[PDB]
Amino acid sequence: HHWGYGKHNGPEHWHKDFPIAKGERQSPVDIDTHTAKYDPSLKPLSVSYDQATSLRILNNGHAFNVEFDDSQDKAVLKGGPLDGTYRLIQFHFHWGSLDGQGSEHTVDKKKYAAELHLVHWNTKYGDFGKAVQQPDGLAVLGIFLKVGSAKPGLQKVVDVLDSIKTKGKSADFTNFDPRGLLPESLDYWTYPGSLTTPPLLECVTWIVLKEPISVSSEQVLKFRKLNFNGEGEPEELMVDNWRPAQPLKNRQIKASFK
């Protein structure tokens, strides 16, 4: 009854309602660094988030999303392996119950504490719903989170989590700058894939950053206090909302560095 990350409705059961789960370009995948091909024709990423307008934070039952105003080219991603402009629509995280797990993508089999996904859609398609019907409709920027020192810029997200504890709750979230979540270097790996949660549409160009960001134990602890359940229902902590690495099949992971 509806998908989730539990024993009875987790990733291994998703294929029953979403056949694309066993597709040819499914994500996430394991990044074998010795097998990725350095492609010198890849251009540098162009992240322009100076005019980004955040609006709301919401607990949707499987993660929390910070939504942005995408009615205009306010925050965009260009360059790299991309053709055209992609607008930021929302960002969310995947994390674990323990510090040694939580990321969806892995590097040489290494799992990180969590993973940030900044979701963008190709402006050529007019709206998000149209973009998901195209093989190059989405671009998701993935950033790994390692446990260590606190990340100043993530604290604002951490503070409001108390007001969106259960499924369905949302809170106004204005003036948040997503530039505070970026690592120092923009070196990345790229490959064609899919959304990592149902409907699992194979419409994504994945751009995974080599350099992870550090967050304090206390910061990730707060993510773990959220609920999958709605107000009133029995409590199920929102942890381990990540999908296991999928088969690479006939794809190649290119690297923008050597």
Positions at the binding site for substrate = 196-197
Q: Which residues touch 232 (CB under 8 Å, ≥6 apart)?
A: none
Residues near ligand SBR, by CB under 6 A: 117, 119, 128-129, 132, 140, 195-197, 199
Toward ligand SBR, which CB reaches closer, 124 or 216?
Answer: 124
Query: Are the C-beta atoms of 163 and 169 separated by less than 8 Å?
Result: yes
- 139 near Hg ion, rule: CB under 5 A: no
Q: Which does 195 bind (CB under 5 to 8 A by kind): Zn ion, ligand SBR, Hg ion, none?
A: ligand SBR
Tell the smallest beta-carbon distance from residue 114 to Zn ion (Å).
Answer: 10
Rounded Cα distance between 250 and 155, Å, is 40
Which is it for the CA torsion 45, 46, 47, 53, positive or negative? negative
Annotated binding site for Zn(2+), which residues? 92, 94, 117
* Structure-token pair, residue 167: 């499924």
Rounded Cα distance between 258 and 250, Å, is 23
Toward Hg ion, which CB reaches closer, 200 or 203?
Answer: 203
- 203 near Hg ion, rule: CB under 5 A: yes
Tell the smallest beta-carbon distance from residue 41 to Zn ion (Å).
Answer: 28
Q: Which does 203 bind (CB under 5 to 8 A by kind): ligand SBR, Zn ion, Hg ion, none?
A: Hg ion
Strand partners, 116: 93, 143
Tell the smallest beta-carbon distance from residue 22 to ligand SBR (Å).
Answer: 17
**175 CB neighbour count, 10 Å cutoff:** 9
DSSP state of 223: H
Annotated binding site, which residues? 92, 94, 117, 196-197
Active site residue 1: no
Provide, for the chain, the percentages of residues in helix, strand and coil under a 3-state DSSP scheme, each rounded to the nearest 5: 15, 30, 55
Tell the smallest beta-carbon distance from residue 90 to Zn ion (Å).
Answer: 10
DSSP state of 6: S
Instruction: Count Cα atoms within 13 angstroms, Cβ side, for 161.
Output: 20
Tell the smallest beta-carbon distance from residue 38 to ligand SBR (Å).
Answer: 26
Toward Hg ion, which CB reaches closer, 131 or 226?
Answer: 131
Toward Hg ion, which CB reaches closer, 157 or 201?
Answer: 201
Q: Which of 34, 62, 105, 120 is catalytic?
A: 62
* Structure-token pair, residue 162: 């108390």
Q: Which does 128 bind (CB under 5 to 8 A by kind): Hg ion, Zn ion, ligand SBR, none?
A: ligand SBR
Strand partners, 218: none
Residues near Zn ion, by CB under 5 A: 117
Judged by the rule CB under 5 A, the positions of this chain that interact with Hg ion are: 201, 203
Q: Which residue numbers are catalytic? A: 62
